[PDB]
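Our collaborator T.R. sent over the components below with a one-line note: 'Predict the complex.' Nothing else. No constraints on interfaces, no templates requested, no preferences about which chain binds where. So this is a plain run: every listed entity goes in together, and whatever single assembly comes back becomes the starting point for the next discussion.
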Amino acid sequence: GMTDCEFGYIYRLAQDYLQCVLQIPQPGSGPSKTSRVLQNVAFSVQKEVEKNLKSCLDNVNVVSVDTARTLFNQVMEKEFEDGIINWGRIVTIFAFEGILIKKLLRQQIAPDVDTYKEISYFVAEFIMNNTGEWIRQNGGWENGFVKKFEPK
Amino acid sequence: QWAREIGAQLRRMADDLNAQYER
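Returned assembly:
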């Protein structure tokens, strides 16, 4: 709905997607309708990004949450610097946090079970601060994203 | 250099993806 552009909702989407990538079970009936649609398309994109940018991503060592955060912000700053926002770009934010959590799982010097909660937090910060107004104006997750990305 | 290259390439892939849903 109208308020699904606020932090708590976005943070839950970002956390849900990292739990999907890490194959962590979140108990209950399941993720929301938004998350269910987002996880499929974000994962498809993630696999294509991993393949297309494999040589680039081989030079990427994500050894700490602080490196993950600066790298994420550097990548997102450049991706969005032309001022354009669309749902495809928003999907790539989720795909990229999935890449970061996989690199951390292998490379993090001092891993902690709550790491995915810290990554998804700064991801939600970026989405809210840089795309939240556009999300709201375009129908939010329920009337915008899901309507365009759910099955016909 | 790598982060900046990744960002530009994510933009390219995102806009191609987006065109399949924004007609």
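Summary for T.R.: Chain A has one domain: 1-152.
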